[PDB]
A = this chain, B = another copy of it.
Amino acid sequence: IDPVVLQRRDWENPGVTQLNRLAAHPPFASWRNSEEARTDRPSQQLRSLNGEWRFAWFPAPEAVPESWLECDLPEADTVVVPSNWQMHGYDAPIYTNVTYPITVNPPFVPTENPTGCYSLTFNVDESWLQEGQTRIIFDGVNSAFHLWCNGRWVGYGQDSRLPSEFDLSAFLRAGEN
């Protein structure tokens, strides 16, 4: 995968902690019924994309083949999301206390940078696209990520412990995405 994304190396620049990320806010559900809001019941406007996803491990972002942007890699596995890929055995989890698990050379990280390629094919109803705004919410991604929707680059996010949100309204189509 290329070109601006690999050349710009946003994950080695503390001046770039996000690209195209929406403003942070308190928890939303966008109820269209007041009584459902009052009683804190599920909202039709808030969908979980949790469940079975496609996943492939790579030793570095340079190793990621371009075709992955367009379609599923045959060598990928089907895995549960949310998950830490170390818990599925793709590489080792590391326990260190104080000493960084990487060479201390800010803002640089090792060239061998384990890379998790997650993908999902899913439906979007036309009602969601005729009007209004459809965003995706990643509550936790460790430690940084680039996002594509239907082959098009959407954005980038950092901070493993807060939600990253991106407007997908111009990226989605009715049916399979």
| Complex copy number for this chain | 2
Q: Is A162 on the interface with B (CB-CB < 8 A)?
A: no
Whole-angstrom distance between the Cβ of A70 and the nearest chain B Cβ: 19
> Would you call A4 and B15 a contact (CB within 8 A)?
no
Q: Which of B4, B15, B17 contacts A8 (CB 8 A)?
A: B4
Whole-angstrom distance between the Cβ of A8 and the nearest chain B Cβ: 6
Size class of the contact patch on chain A: 10 to 19
Complex CA–CA separation, A15 to B158 (angstroms)? 13
Whole-angstrom distance between the Cβ of A164 and the nearest chain B Cβ: 14
Q: Is A174 on the interface with B (CB-CB < 8 A)?
A: no
Chain B residues with Cβ below 8 Å from A51 are none
Whole-angstrom distance between the Cβ of A1 and the nearest chain B Cβ: 14
Chain B residues with Cβ below 8 Å from A15 are 15-19
Chain B residues with Cβ below 8 Å from A4 are 3-4, 7-8
A: residues with CB less than 8 A from B are 3-4, 7-8, 13, 15-19
Report 13 cross-chain contacts, Cβ distance below 8 Å, ordered by A residue: A3-B3, A3-B4, A4-B4, A4-B7, A4-B8, A8-B8, A13-B19, A15-B15, A15-B16, A15-B17, A15-B18, A15-B19, A16-B16
